Design an enzyme around this catalytic site. Structure first.
Site, mmCIF file in Angstrom:
data_model
loop_
_atom_site.group_PDB
_atom_site.id
_atom_site.type_symbol
_atom_site.label_atom_id
_atom_site.label_comp_id
_atom_site.label_asym_id
_atom_site.label_seq_id
_atom_site.Cartn_x
_atom_site.Cartn_y
_atom_site.Cartn_z
ATOM 1 N N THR A 120 54.816 0.859 -27.554
ATOM 2 C CA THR A 120 53.666 0.502 -26.739
ATOM 3 C C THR A 120 53.835 0.747 -25.229
ATOM 4 O OG1 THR A 120 54.504 -1.774 -26.768
ATOM 5 C CG2 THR A 120 52.849 -1.180 -28.421
ATOM 6 N N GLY A 166 53.415 1.986 -21.744
ATOM 7 C CA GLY A 166 52.272 2.604 -21.084
ATOM 8 C C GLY A 166 50.883 2.173 -21.535
ATOM 9 N N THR A 167 50.829 1.271 -22.504
ATOM 10 C CA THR A 167 49.558 0.788 -23.017
ATOM 11 C C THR A 167 48.622 0.340 -21.902
ATOM 12 O OG1 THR A 167 50.536 0.076 -25.113
ATOM 13 C CG2 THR A 167 48.446 -0.934 -24.478
ATOM 14 N N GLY A 168 49.125 -0.541 -21.040
ATOM 15 C CA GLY A 168 48.342 -1.056 -19.930
ATOM 16 C C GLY A 168 47.770 0.018 -19.031
ATOM 17 N N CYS A 169 48.599 0.989 -18.642
ATOM 18 C CA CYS A 169 48.149 2.083 -17.792
ATOM 19 C C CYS A 169 47.080 2.868 -18.547
ATOM 20 C CB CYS A 169 49.308 3.040 -17.460
ATOM 21 S SG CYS A 169 50.694 2.367 -16.510
HETATM 22 C C1 LIG Z 1 54.822 3.776 -12.559
HETATM 23 C C2 LIG Z 1 54.598 2.674 -13.502
HETATM 24 N N1 LIG Z 1 53.388 1.954 -13.347
HETATM 25 C C3 LIG Z 1 53.101 0.876 -14.221
HETATM 26 C C4 LIG Z 1 53.978 0.468 -15.268
HETATM 27 C C5 LIG Z 1 53.780 -0.652 -16.248
HETATM 28 O O1 LIG Z 1 54.895 -1.842 -16.301
HETATM 29 C C6 LIG Z 1 55.257 1.289 -15.369
HETATM 30 N N2 LIG Z 1 56.195 1.038 -16.298
HETATM 31 N N3 LIG Z 1 55.484 2.373 -14.445
#
Ligand SMILES: Cc1ncc(CO)c(N)n1
Ligand SMILES: Cc1ncc(CO)c(N)n1
Lengths: 254, 254
Positions: free
Chosen positions: B196, B198-201
């Site tokens: 999962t 990068g899910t949030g992005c």
């Molecule tokens: C650059 C970047 N932005 C957001 C997240 C999310 O924790 C991440 N892992 N890396």
């Protein structure tokens, strides 16, 4: 199709037409998971370069390791290298991880126009990096600069430079006018638009992403060009920028 | 479909699963030309963060201007902001160019775990940025941190925080548990994988790219989730990294 991961080591373009933005888009469009190591940041634009921001070679190195120590890389495309230390760091990691299918575009000038060629960088490039690229994609001026020879006047001279580049380590060479050079021999290979920003990056990224799905460089050179031509053929359907626009990396999807 | 250009203002992830890499991939997959302004570089990985590299707020500003002074931006997603000066520079440009459809994810912690919340940054964020976002997408801890309130215990408290975030300027709020808050009212909204990253992005980038093609935030929240679910549903077909993998942004194409 088998999963192939592609990696790009290059500069950035905020407008999204060139740099890793273009490389990453191209990988995506041609069915490859994309990875990227940033060598330089640049406030770039469809109207040229506003400014360049240097990154510490060490961080570039840190980026390479974060990737190669975790993700299996099947193909690699190299763009802007900026300076000697980056070139060295890149070549070193490439050598350590036995990286193959390395496509090296020759970013030794500038969109807005300017020879971004550190004399110290070019020498390091020909001695330390060339022996590790599978395919190099320079145009005439660039080919000359790498060989430190006069700009090819005739076809014979152009063919001599291709062969010279092979002897320097390159497994293959695509002299852009287009001639493909291999140990086997040579092979010869329509733009109706003005929005050509990022073409070079796109072609090299495409050659990289496509290589693992073909028998030979010739076969892959053939498909990548066809594809790039389709991307240019739709460049005008995009509404980005006031200057020279990018190609449409996703002509096949939307 | 009408051409829509999407812009991401965030950090980088060399492994390509999160950051602008994920944002740019998501835009591409959902039919939008992508643009990106880098706020921070990070040698990141499927096994966590190795290191972070700061960028001068001025260059971030330079990047914003290179983009907004040339490309028409229809939607914007904001990720990692890092420090007060970046937040300020971003808010300022957002205000100057009357930027709308701003989706703000709340990156005030860390994948590997760590509250990346500069106490000075958070205050600046709530006072200078919040009044310019169309939709904010925080989870409970994040929502609490922005409000400087205790972590919501009950559903009532959770609903109170959503409404409070609206009053602070946000046009809409998507409290992730998921509840969508609008001036109109609230609306309520299965992961079978471990990859999962990068899910949030991805969700925020998706909400941004999708907004211009829908009637309301509810409609767009609905499609983006469906799509993200499909991306997660194929996450395991990818062969990237040894730790926690990314979702498959291109499940629909290859
Ligand atoms: C650059 C970047 N932005 C957001 C997240 C999310 O924790 C991440 N892992 N890396
Ligand atoms: C970062 C970057 N790499 C390559 C090119 C090709 O001119 C460009 N314009 N910008």
């Amino acid at each position: 199709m088998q999963r192939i991961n592609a990696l790009t080591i290059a500069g950035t373009d905020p407008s999204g037409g060139a740099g890793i933005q273009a490389d990453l888009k191209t990988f995506s469009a041609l069915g490859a998971y994309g990875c990227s190591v940033i060598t330089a940041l640049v406030a770039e634009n469809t109207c040229g370069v506003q400014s360049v921001y240097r990154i510490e070679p060490d961080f570039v190195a840190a980026q390479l390791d974060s990737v190669f120590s975790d993700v299996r890389i099947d193909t690699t495309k190299i763009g802007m290298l900026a300076e000697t230390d980056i070139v060295e760091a890149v070549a070193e990691r490439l050598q350590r991880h036995h990286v193959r299918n390395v496509v090296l575009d020759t970013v030794m000038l500038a969109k807005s126009g300017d020879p971004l060629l550190s004399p110290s960088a070019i020498e390091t490039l020909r001695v330390r990096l060339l022996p590790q690229v599978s395919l190099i994609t320079p145009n005439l001026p660039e080919a000359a600069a790498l060989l430190d020879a006069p700009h090819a006047r005739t076809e014979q001279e152009m063919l001599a430079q291709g062969r010279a580049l092979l002897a320097m380590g390159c497994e293959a060479v695509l002299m852009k006018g287009d001639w493909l050079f291999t140990r086997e021999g040579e092979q010869r290979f329509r733009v109706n638009t003005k929005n050509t920003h990022g073409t070079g990056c796109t072609l090299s990224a495409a050659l990289a992403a496509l290589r693992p799905r073909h028998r030979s460089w010739g076969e892959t050179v053939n498909e990548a060009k066809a594809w790039l031509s389709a991307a240019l053929a739709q460049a005008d359907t995009l509404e980005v920028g006031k200057g020279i626009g990018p190609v449409h990396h996703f002509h096949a999807w939307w």
